[PDB]
Every structure is written in C-alpha cells, then in structure tokens.
Amino acid sequence: DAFRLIDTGALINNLEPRQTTSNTGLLNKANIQALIHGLNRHYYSLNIDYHKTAKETKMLMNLHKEQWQSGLKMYDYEEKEESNLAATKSMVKIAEQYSKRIEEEKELTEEELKTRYVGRQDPKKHLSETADETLENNIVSVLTAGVNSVAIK
Amino acid sequence: IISLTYKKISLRDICLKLNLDSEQTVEYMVSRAIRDGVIEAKINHEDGFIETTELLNIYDSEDPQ
Amino acid sequence: SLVKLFTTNELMRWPIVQKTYEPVLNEDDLAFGGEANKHHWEDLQKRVIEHNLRVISEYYSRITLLRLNELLDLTESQTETYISDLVNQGIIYAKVNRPAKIVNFEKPKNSSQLLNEWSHNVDELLEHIETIGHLITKEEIMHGL
Amino acid sequence: TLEPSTSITLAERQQLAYDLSISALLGDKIYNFGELLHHPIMETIVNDSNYDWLFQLLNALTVGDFDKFDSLIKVQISKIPILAQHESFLRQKICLMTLIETVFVKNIRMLSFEDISKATHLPKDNVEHLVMRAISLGLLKGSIDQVNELVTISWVQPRIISGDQITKMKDRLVEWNDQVEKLGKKMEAR
Amino acid sequence: HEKVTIAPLVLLSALDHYERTQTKENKRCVGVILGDANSSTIRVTNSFALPFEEDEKNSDVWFLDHNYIENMNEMCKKINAKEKLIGWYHSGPKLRASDLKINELFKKYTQNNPLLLIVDVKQQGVGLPTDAYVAIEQEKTFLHLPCTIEAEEAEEIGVEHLLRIRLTNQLKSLKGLQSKLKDVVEYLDKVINKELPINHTILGKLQDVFNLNNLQKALTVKTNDELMVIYISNLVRSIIAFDDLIENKIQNKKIQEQRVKD
C-alpha cells in the first residue's frame, strides 16, 4: 500500500479517477474494510502495479516458477520415490481403504429407481472426494514404473 | 481331465481309464492336445511317462500386463 | 594381534601359534584355568570358532559343508553344534543343508527388492551431473593456460 | 607433484626414490608401484644399480613370476615373506577389477576360480582362501560361490591406468544414442 | 566439504547493476556478498556491487577500492547486524588474473574462505546462472560446492506472484538424459586423441560413476524381482481404471433422469 497526499480535497483540486482502477470501495469493504471510501485523507486512491524486464523474465523462469527443479534432474525423481518407498506401498494401501470406505457410506443412499435412504448430496460427496484419489493412483503408477524404466540396465 | 490329475502318469495308465486301443494309439492322441498350447506338457518315450511342463508362477511374465 | 587375527584367521596355524608362544594360555600361573592342559584347548577353541564363523558369512556367501569342516577343524556332527548356538543367541545366521552338504548365506528377503536394494542407486547418478558440472570450469582453466 | 618445494640434487633423488621403493614393497595401499611412473620419480632415476626394482615390478604383475624379481634383489628384503604376499595381492587386484569394466564390453559381472587360477598361477584350493584375504584388507566388497565356482565382486578403488576403459565409456553412451529416437518422438507427440 | 544456499533475490539483483552501468563484454562487474559462513551450509542473504575497472588487454590490471568496502560494512551494521562479509562475486564467464589475485584481498575483511561466484548474464545452459567456487591453499584449484537456491516462505512465493502435469514432468527427464550424453562425450574426447592434458586425477572420479544402460547388468535376473512392484502397481490400477466406470455408471442415471423430466 502506497500513499499520495491530496492536500485539500474539498472542491476542484484534480481528478484522481483517471489513471487506473479507481472508484473502489464498494459497500463497506475496501482492503482491511475499515477504510471504505475516504481511505486515509481525501481518497488517495491506492493503485499499485508491477513490471518485468527482459532479464527479469528469463531469471524467474529458470529459478522459481512453482518449485525449483533445475540444476539436477534424475535425483528429484529417485529421491521422491526413495523416501516414499515404504510410504508409497503404505499410501497405496492406506488410501485404498479410505477410498472404498467413503464409497461404502454415501453411495448406499441411491440404489433403486425410487427413494430409499433419501440421498441428497451423498452421491456427490464420494464422487468429488474420490475423483483425485483415482487420479493420484495413476500418477504414482507411471512414476514408480518410469523411474526404474528408461535404460539404467 | 486325466492330465491335470496326474502330472507324471504312465503310458499304459491312460489306456486303462479310457479303455483305449493300444499304447501307440494314445501316443499320437496326446501329442494332438498340446498342439495349440492347451495341455502344455511333454511326452517322454524313454522314461515311460508323460510329464506336465506347467510350473505356474506365470505372474513373473508379461501376461498380467 | 590375536584379537585382530579373528577376522583373517583360517584356523590353520591356530594350534601352532598357541604351541610356539604360550604366555597366557597353556603354561601360566595367575588366571590359570583347568586341571592342566584340558580346559585351555577347549574353551579357547570354542571361542575362535565363533569369531571365525561370524566373518565367514560376511565373506563366503556359498560354501561347501565338507570344506566348512576343514576351516573350523570340526566334523559333520560337531559343526552343527556350534552354528546352532550362535543362531539361538542371536549372533549370526546362515544356511545348513544336511542331505546336500551345502552351506549358503541365506540373504534375508525383508529387503523386498525395489523397496531396499534400489534405494542405493541414488549416489550412482548423484555423483555424475554434480561432479562433471563442477569440473566444466576446471577444464577451461587447465587447457586455457 | 611439487616442483619448487623440496629442492635436492640428482644424487639425493635416487636415495629418496629408494625409500619410496622399499615403502611400497611391504604394502599394497595407494595404487601400486606404477603410481611413481607418472610422478617425477621413476623418470628422474637410473635404470641400473638396482634402481629398476620399480620398473621390474610393473610388468611382473601381468607376467606373474616372482623368481625374476627375487634374483635382482638382495637378502635384506627377500628374507621377509610379506614382500611375496603383498606382491601377489597387486597381481590379483588387477584381475578383481576386471569384473565390471576392463575387458568385457557388456559390463557383465562374473568371475570364476579357473580364470584367477591361471592369472595367479595357483591351484583351485589356494585361490579360494586368497580372495578372502583381499576382501578382509578393505580392497573390494563382495562374496564368492564355492558351489558353482563363481566370484562376485564389485569395483571401488580406481587405478592410474588409462586406455582400457576409454573406448567403453563411449560405447556405453552409444546405447543411449539409439534411445533418443523412440522415446523422444513418442513423448513429444503426446 | 561445505554447501552453498543463495536466495533468488541475490542472483537477480546482481544482474541488474550489470546493465545499469552499460557494461559491455570487455568489462566485468565485481561485488561482495553477505551471510553466515560459520555453518556447513553457506547462506547468502545480501549482495552489493563495487566500482570494478579492468583492462581488456592485460589480466594483471584491476581496480579495487577497500574504502568503499569498509564504508559498505559500516552501512550494513545499521540495517542488518547479523550479516557479515562471507566473500565476493564477479561477472563474466572468463577467469583471468584480475579475479584470481583479488581473492586474497577480500580475505583480510572475510573470516572464512571467500566464496567465488561467476554470474552468467546470458544464462547459457541448464540451470544455476551463478556457480559457487571455493579455493584451497593446498596446487590451488577452484572447486564448486553444492550450491542450491532456497529462500523464506514470503520470499519464494513473492517472485511467484510477480511471474504469474505427468507429461510435462517427463519432458525434463529427456533433458537430463542428453545431459549425461553431451557432458561425457565432449569432455572425454578432449582428454584423448589430440592434445592430452595432464590427467588421470579426474579419471578416477569419472569411472566411479560407471561401475555402479549405465549401471549394472548383473542384477538382470534380480531386476525381474524388483520389477514385481511395478507389476503390482498394475494390479490395483486395473481396478482404478474400473473405478472410473463407477462414476461413469452413476452419471448414467443423470441423463436417464433428464429423459424422464423431458
């Protein structure tokens, strides 16, 4: 947050709402929500934007985008699997129970064509929770098979 | 049916159960069963008994994939 | 040297070393066990077999039982007596095949293959890119000058 | 390797090389007698007057004849059996390192008691107990098989020699060359 | 050995003053770094440049003013007192007598061994635009410590907001495979054939990778037992692929219900 002194904001001083993104303060919510309209003094009209040059653009892409994987290659694949060796066999088995235990609870509401247990949001609970679980199993299946694959005798 | 019961069975033991003709007749017919890979066994003429070549343990191969 | 010998001791010269030099063993005054010579050739012989058989598993993975009796100076019936005591006391473990006379190491299967033995391959590919990547500059310094 | 430090005359270099020679006779550590070849030691001395003991032991490892070196030495170093014991160890260490990359191009790790018998000029009974002595000293890690008569040992200690493994390091990358196509094109197509 | 950890704020801040001075290829910029060198992991939390002048025709000509360094250390005591001078960096790919002789000059004000840094302005190849080099008195040789890039929670995400799956992760695998090929072939061919450099000291470390299709064919029989875990992964995945038919069959009731309402 920056600050710009408006001096006398009574009548005919200058037009702040021109440059970029002005006329904020909808209802009582602005930033911390305690400032609302008047903000600090005579509506200093906070606006801040960033920029990147040609050198700063290639620097961030080669350093930090989401996580830093650069500088070394096959270690990030193996070390993630090696530390998880006892965990992967466990996580596949542990999440195997919790996957069906959710399917064995909310899914039983909708069975026949008519209404029995009066399912409402129950059939949609086990669908969204187990949607990523079936995806994570396919991801670790390729990673576990891919690292040991690709040559290395 | 008779091959799955006895892994190693004598040549004359098959003719007694099925009332076949002779030993030379059954020797030709057993060779017809493993043609397509059904029984998957071998015939020992000098040893005198038919031995099954299936050790199971097929999971170590690519068949599950 | 006798303590460190137990690693490389084949028990071939064991009766020779005790006979040539016998300061604390066969002829002694203080801390002298046995009536005369009998407990010195027994208790000392039982210990050196335990120390020798311990490193055999770390060296010989598969050894013939007929050859094992020559290294430990025992017989077929005597060898099974000492190896059974070390396993019962939790010292070492090995394979004893009575009809085939084959003594193997019997590597434990608790490693579960990929879950253990493959975890040692990290330093194989860790010292490749990290090392050569450090020596790229050194190559230009030696040849450039 | 230091030229400026330890500045001595030519006569003192032969006396210094004599201490370097007798020190390596009684132990196998730090490579072998061929280590001083590339170092400015063996090249700064004379090939006669019993100063060639370092050069004679270079080819004696491959030939495997103790009588050639024993006739060119004196009674001082020949009366100790340690000289003959550690000399035969360096002869085996060359063969023990052939299990990974020396000769075989396929990097197949195998050794038999018959191959080491002809290299060390020893029968099958002596080579079984001789391998254990080399492992117990901390040279290489591994075990053997008496039932199938096989020796399984990895490779740890590097050597100073070159030219044997140079061709294979490129040949092992040739197998990587044929692997750039199939998985390179199919991955980009996805 | 030791380790090096440099935040991304230090790396990009060193590149900015390079262009702001309009420094061409004939000139290079030299600067100093701050952090804690006492532990085994060297951390660089700050950096400052210096008015470095060098002649392009002579490697023995350099301009280094310690009075600006003495003043810089006094100015940092009023900002961050926990930071001390752990070494110095410089720009340019080339290493000449200018940067080699000044390594002992910064040693007077640096308690630990000054950590040398080569900041690549063009960012040519792989990652790590800056390499951390350390020198030994015993013969001198430039060795690279395991330099890593790490920052705090607010510093790592801060650059993410300014910059802003399985197939993409496999794309970086092939780039690492060619790194194994291109690094060995180019380096090994230089030692052999024409112009043999003094070597066999490095060769011992190179062949140390090859002993342990680069690894072992002796486990091929045992590999099938190691591959069993991969076959086990397909046991459940066959049902996981069938688990997608669970939702696929439940979603059939929705459209069938739409035909009833229609």
Give yes or no for a contact between D109 and D152, defined as CB atoms under 8 angstroms apart.
yes
DSSP three-state, residue B39? coil
Provide φ and ψ at A9, rounded to 5°: -105, 20
Would you state the torsion angle of the CA atoms of residues A26, A28, A31, A35, taken in this order, to the nearest 10 degrees? 120
Q: Which residues contact E53 (CB under 8 A, 6 or more apart)?
A: E27, E62, E63
The CA distance from A145 to A77, in Å, is: 11
CB-nearest to C63 from D136, D146, D152 is D146
CA distance C74 to C70: 7
Report d(CA E130, CA E9) in Å as an integer. Answer: 12
Alpha helices per DSSP H over chain D: 10-25, 35-38, 53-63, 66-70, 75-78, 81-96, 113-120, 124-136, 166-177, 179-189
Amino acid at D5: S
> What ranges make up the beta strands (E) of E179-219?
none
E232 — contact with chain C (CB < 8 Å)? Answer: no
Residue A127 to residue E129, Cβ atoms within 8 A = no
Could you tell me which chain E residue has the CA closest to the CA of A59?
E12
CATH number at residue E17: 3.40.140.10
In chain D, residues with a C-beta closer than 8 Å to the C-beta of A151 are: 175-176, 179
Q: Write out chain A residues lying below 8 Å of D107, CB-based.
A: 153
C-beta atoms of A148 and E126 within 8 A? no
Which partners does chain B have (≥3 C-beta pairs < 8 Å)? Answer: E
Q: In whole angstroms, how large is the CA radius of gyration of chain C?
A: 24
Residue in C8, C10, C60 closest to D143 by CB: C60
Are A85 and C126 inside 8 Å of each other by CB?
no
CA end-to-end span of chain E: 75
Q: How far apart are CA D101 and CA B65, in angstroms?
A: 35
Technique employed here was cryo-EM
DSSP string of A79-148?
A: HHHHHTHHHHHHHHHHHHHHHHHHHTTTGGG--SSS-SS--SSHHHHHHHHTHHHHHHHHHHHHHHHHHH
Q: Which of D172, D175, D183 is nearest residue E210 as measured by Cβ atoms?
A: D172
Is A148 in CB contact (< 8 Å) with chain C?
A: yes
Residues of chain C in contact with residue A85, where contact means CB-CB under 8 angstroms, are 114-116, 118-119
Say how far apart CA E242 and CA A138 lie, in whole Å. Answer: 12
DSSP annotation of D4: S
Q: Is A151 on the interface with D (CB under 8 A)?
A: yes
Q: Which residues of E touch D38 (CB under 8 A)?
A: 200
Residue E49 to residue E31: CA distance in whole angstroms: 4
Sign of the Cα pseudo-torsion (E211, E214, E218, E221, in order)? positive
d(CA A80, CA E169): 13
Task: Give the span between the Cα atoms of C68 and A118, in whole angstroms.
Answer: 76
Interface probe for C, chosen from D147, D148, D150 (most Cβ of C below 10 Å), is D147
Distance between C139 CA and the closest CA of chain A, angstroms: 19
Say if B63 is an interface residue toward chain E (CB within 8 Å).
no
Asked if C122's CB is within 8 angstroms of A78's CB, the reply is yes
Whose CA is closest to D134, among D119, D148, C74, C120? D119
Contact A151 D107 (CB under 8 A): no
D2 to chain E: which residues are within 8 Å by CB? Answer: 139
Chains that touch E (3 or more CB pairs under 8 A): A, B, C, D
> Are A1 and A46 spatial neighbours (Cβ–Cβ below 8 Å)?
yes
- Cα distance from A145 to chain D (closest Cα, Å)? 15
| Chains B and D, touching by 3 or more CB pairs within 8 angstroms | no
User: CB atoms < 10 A from the CB of D173, how many?
Assistant: 17
Residues of E in contact with C133 (CB under 8 A): 126, 144, 183
Q: Which residues in chain A are closer than 8 Å to C129, comparing Cβ atoms?
A: 72-74
Interface of C with E in 100-129 (CB under 8 A): 112-115, 117-118, 121, 123-125, 127-129
Q: Is B61 on the interface with E (CB under 8 A)?
A: no
Residue E104: half-sphere exposure toward Cβ, Cα within 13 Å = 6
Minimum distance, in Å, between the CA of residue E185 and any CA atom of chain D:
7
The secondary structure element, H or E, covering residue E67 is helix E66-76
For residue D132, what is the nearest residue in chain C, using CA coordinates? C59
D179/A151 touch (CB, cutoff 8 Å), yes or no: yes
Q: Which domain holds residue E122?
A: 1-164
**Contact D164/D102 with Cβ under 8 angstroms?**
yes
> CB D183 to CB A150 under 8 A?
yes
User: Per the CB < 8 Å rule, is D179 touching A153?
Assistant: no
Query: β-strands D142-145, C60-64: how paired?
Result: parallel
Best C110, C111, C121 residue to mutate vs chain A (most A CBs within 10 Å):
C121
The CA-atom distances, in angstroms, between C32 and each of A52, C19, C26, C42 are: 89, 16, 8, 14
Whole-angstrom Cα distance, residue A107 to residue D110?
A: 58
> Which of C132, C141, C142, C143 to mutate to probe the E interface, most E CBs <10 Å?
C132
Cβ contacts (< 8 Å) between C9 and chain D: which residues? none
**Set of chain B residues whose Cβ sits within 8 Å of the Cβ of E231:** 59, 64-65
* E202 touching chain C per CB within 8 A: yes
CA E25 and chain centroid, separation: 23
Structure tokens given for A43:
């509506």
* Segment holding E162, helix H or strand E: helix E153-163
